[PDB]
Amino acid sequence: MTHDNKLQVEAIKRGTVIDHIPAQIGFKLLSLFKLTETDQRITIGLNLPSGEMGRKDLIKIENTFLSEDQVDQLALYAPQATVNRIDNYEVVGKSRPSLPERIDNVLVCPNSNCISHAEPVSSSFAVRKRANDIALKCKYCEKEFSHNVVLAN
Amino acid sequence: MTHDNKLQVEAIKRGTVIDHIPAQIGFKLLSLFKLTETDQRITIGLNLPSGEMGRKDLIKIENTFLSEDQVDQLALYAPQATVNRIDNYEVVGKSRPSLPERIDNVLVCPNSNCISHAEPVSSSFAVRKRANDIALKCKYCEKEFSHNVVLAN
Amino acid sequence: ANPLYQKHIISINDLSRDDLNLVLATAAKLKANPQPELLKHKVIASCFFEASTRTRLSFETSMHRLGASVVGFSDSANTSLGKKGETLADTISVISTYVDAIVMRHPQEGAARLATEFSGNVPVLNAGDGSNQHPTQTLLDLFTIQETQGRLDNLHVAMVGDLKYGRTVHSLTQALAKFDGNRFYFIAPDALAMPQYILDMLDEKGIAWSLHSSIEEVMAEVDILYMTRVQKERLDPSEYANVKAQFVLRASDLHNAKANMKVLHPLPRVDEIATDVDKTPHAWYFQQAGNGIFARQALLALVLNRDLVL
Amino acid sequence: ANPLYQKHIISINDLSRDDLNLVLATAAKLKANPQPELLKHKVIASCFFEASTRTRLSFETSMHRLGASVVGFSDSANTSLGKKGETLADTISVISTYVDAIVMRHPQEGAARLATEFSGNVPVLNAGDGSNQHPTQTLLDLFTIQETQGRLDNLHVAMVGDLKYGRTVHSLTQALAKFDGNRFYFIAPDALAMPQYILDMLDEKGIAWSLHSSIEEVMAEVDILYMTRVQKERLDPSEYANVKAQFVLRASDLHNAKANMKVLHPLPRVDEIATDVDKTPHAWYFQQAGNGIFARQALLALVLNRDLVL
Amino acid sequence: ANPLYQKHIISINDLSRDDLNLVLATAAKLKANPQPELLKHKVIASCFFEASTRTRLSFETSMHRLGASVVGFSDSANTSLGKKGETLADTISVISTYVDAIVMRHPQEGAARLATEFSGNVPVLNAGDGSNQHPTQTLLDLFTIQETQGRLDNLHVAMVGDLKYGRTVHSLTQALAKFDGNRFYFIAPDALAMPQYILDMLDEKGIAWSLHSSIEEVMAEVDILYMTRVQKERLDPSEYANVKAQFVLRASDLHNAKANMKVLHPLPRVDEIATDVDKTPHAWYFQQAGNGIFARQALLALVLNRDLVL
Numbered sequence A, B: 001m002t003h004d005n006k007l008q009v010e011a012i013k014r015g016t017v018i019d020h021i022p023a024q025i026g027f028k029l030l031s032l033f034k035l036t037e038t039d040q041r042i043t044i045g046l047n048l049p050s051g052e053m054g055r056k057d058l059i060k061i062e063n064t065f066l067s068e069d070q071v072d073q074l075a076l077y078a079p080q081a082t083v084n085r086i087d088n089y090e091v092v093g094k095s096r097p098s099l100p101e102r103i104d105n106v107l108v109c110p111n112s113n114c115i116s117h118a119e120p121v122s123s124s125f126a127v128r129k130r131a132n133d134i135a136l137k138c139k140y141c142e143k144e145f146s147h148n149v150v151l152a153n
Numbered sequence C, D, E: 001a002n003p004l005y006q007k008h009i010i011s012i013n014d015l016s017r018d019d020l021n022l023v024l025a026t027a028a029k030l031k032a033n034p035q036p037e038l039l040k041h042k043v044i045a046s047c048f049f050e051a052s053t054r055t056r057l058s059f060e061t062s063m064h065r066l067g068a069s070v071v072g073f074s075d076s077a078n079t080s081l082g083k084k085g086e087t088l089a090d091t092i093s094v095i096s097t098y099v100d101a102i103v104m105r106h107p108q109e110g111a112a113r114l115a116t117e118f119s120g121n122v123p124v125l126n127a128g129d130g131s132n133q134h135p136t137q138t139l140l141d142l143f144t145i146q147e148t149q150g151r152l153d154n155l156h157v158a159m160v161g162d163l164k165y166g167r168t169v170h171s172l173t174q175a176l177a178k179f180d181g182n183r184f185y186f187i188a189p190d191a192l193a194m195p196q197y198i199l200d201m202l203d204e205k206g207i208a209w210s211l212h213s214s215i216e217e218v219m220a221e222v223d224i225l226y227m228t229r230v231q232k233e234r235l236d237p238s239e240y241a242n243v244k245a246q247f248v249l250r251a252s253d254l255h256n257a258k259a260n261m262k263v264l265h266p267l268p269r270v271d272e273i274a275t276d277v278d279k280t281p282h283a284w285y286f287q288q289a290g291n292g293i294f295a296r297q298a299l300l301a302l303v304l305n306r307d308l309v310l
Ligand SMILES: NC(=O)C[C@H](NC(=O)CP(=O)(O)O)C(=O)O
Pocket: C051, C052, C053, C054, C055, C056, C128, C134, C137, C166, C167, C168, C228, C229, C266, C267, C268
């Protein structure tokens, strides 16, 4: 078991620690992940120094663990982020978000004429790393978009 | 100065610390008053014990100072909270939020036929202690509603 | 400089018993000794974004009675706000650079308040904003209640009809509550009840008020019977049950009416007041409408002219 | 059971060259050997929420030629989804308890796919969903090309008009790209260019395609000249500069055309194809439309019959 | 008799540098020493067949400021030309027998010119005819440019927005081209470009002008930034792509702006000018609107009064 590396050090017994989250994104995760909904000890660091990574955000939730698809959803929101499963203090499961094949529910098809809007169905797109950015195709209208344009709910 | 549970964090040089925030309120405060919208370091503690209270939240903003009025703005959510002005790592001033006489910009009048919705003006309500909780009267349409229902944009 | 010189007249809530009396006193003075050139060289905008017969016509007639000129519109459909998508704010910012005062009626609540924030030194007079306030109505109303009762205090007053949306009663109630010992009777469908902010205001002043289901139930002890029109244009489809007049005063309902008793109505009336009431000695809504001339000349004289009229 | 038995027909992108060929081989047989009682005792639902002439009528006729019954609507205005506010989902949920298959055309993209999620064991056939897919269009287009050319490989195909909102070329391009050595020529206004997800598909397959702003540029090498109508009903106002057909085919533009070339058009045509083209040996849109009967008979039989042997 | 006495004011093309200066000089004189009875006994028609807030209201306010009476309409819908099918010519022939001058705004280009041919000795003042000319706008504009720049020559001026349909820029450009060494920058979508007859006119005068894609690209060297509204009501469906404001001046775009630099807009503005620009020291479109009072009083004084004001 260790303490930390950067200036401010922390320590939790069991839970998840999302580190290396890009600036101005951490708070976005608290929202669209309803992480704040829990009643477990939570710790957030916004605009913390990452050394050569400029600044980062960092979240800590006591006795809580994220669904793979949130790291799968994390792949589109913070690919450089690092989700660490912590137990009896200090890691035991340090993973890195992998680009998925598909995303469900959380996304909204930018195509305004997509039946997915008007009707009671859960969204679903297919993830495909293209030139340099990510592209995702709708399960319904079959249109493909830059994950940059889709991230506008 | 701070708390102990294996030498805890939260130790800034200059800025403001919102201590004794009701549980489940610190997230909304960060949402309402758009506090994360800044490059200044921010450390947040959610769901931590206090004894005086069951559990409480804590928000610490760096190089950021709140006016006596900005402090009162919290009276509607964290009435029994304390705002410590920190400079040189030392708390140079402590204040308690007082019921403000008006809430601006933040909320949105529930009256659909109010002119505040259509036009280029900031929302505004007079804060009335309608014994039984807060009553809000819109500067524009002049109709008053209970704090509980006057949503925020 | 008289108390009201260059002041906005947006809500009775901002006026004190003193201001109201100042307007009525001036009104009486002007009615007795008209001052045809008092406001000569003045140009006033008459901007009605919503329908109106007495409020716009009487306001304009008053302006001419005092020697002022008028510019404006009775419908926003042909303004730039109507065909070019201009904000109300921008509309006010430009008009306030042309006229000496702006009289405006608008479909939204708070539009008059809004305009004062973009009109610079040009005063704004509220001819009615949505279902909120109707200041100059309350003034002519007060002028009328005094003219017939001889006082504005210690009166029993019943307000009938749509009290939720009637900007008329909203302002009038608050205006009378600033006077001593008036009793209030509210007769309205449960859906169009007098708003909470008015009741609370009364409670706070120790003013006595009660709710009733029938007119006659209080006919024997009312000094002023204020009838109002159901504001169809403001109702929401889920209130369309109350569109039809629920309380219809008829000539045969005034049998046990106090001699002094008078029927008032801001107008227009649909069927809430049968026409057989028109010739009874209690009907006074037309006299009331005409008094709107003395009250509106009074306010204008006080807002645009510095010295207190003699 | 044949590979298509009980399968949904939503998008070409879900079918293989073998499936396409199966449909085409059956169509060829049914056209030469009619099976009037192949779908006896079957009831198919024809549901159009969007205008149609060829697709619907050919589909319905195909059902009768096979001996099935048809039930449905060519307009949703009188369904409960039109008057009572019912979801498309629920509409599909109940109709799927009555019929053996559902043929549907809808204004929004993805309606055919969403339907399959509510039809249980009832196959859904996509007669066109928004500007996305038009599978049966492609099936008949392919049947026509194969008949006039004798091959679906190494062809020189030009698609003209509105390639963006054209569900017809979206499905056709994807289909022909399942074959070998086809070269594509795209002639369309900048604002209505062939979508990028089709081009990326062409690149991934290593197929040749190129943009041209003139028909005359490709007239000499094309085996199939597929003209299309500007999808006026789908254009966003910011694209109303494109409503009028940019490329208009006249009989005089066919001088350099290969003798075997055929001009195809999903139809209807507005002004993109002058009537003087109808008399030339190249005009083939009407014979094409007729092939819709054989193509759709084929699909309906393959999806509703476990085994077909003729 | 001053140069403009009893003259039609239809197009800046018919006005010389001298006339423009005469109007502005008079404007300055009247602003300093108002003449309340100068036009007493005059009756002027205010005939707006199209929407307007500042042009009609300021024009009328000016008329009253000088002691004249006004008659007219702000909407042709209730005129005989509106409900009985009367020609514009016949409309003018009768009105010219009642008034001393006719101010009119019309949806068609050349209507003002038309009216001068049926108005006999009664002068016609163009409050704007379609997307052609807007003479009195250019006048107030010039009054404003001088008030803030101190001169009307040797200025760098950028005109942004819809230049094809803006009658505002059409007149203003020609007006400034009559002055020495003004530089012109036109920033507009390619579809709403400044018309050829204006460019040719400039070329002929040796006036320097250039086209640009971004505002800031010339922000450092402009003395007057003239923003304009996209004339939605004049566009043809094939131009509906340009409906949305393409160039949106924001408070943060004025960082490297010349100190003297001023933002002007004939108004109304949609979103081409963020409201955060309103309080910067560069915003002057509201001051500009108010100057429309001094410029319109000036023109009226020159057209209806024989002697040159002192
Ligand atoms: N309209 C009414 O029923 C009451 C009141 N009426 C008036 O002011 C008379 P008008 O509509 O100006 O002719 C109002 O506008 O609120």
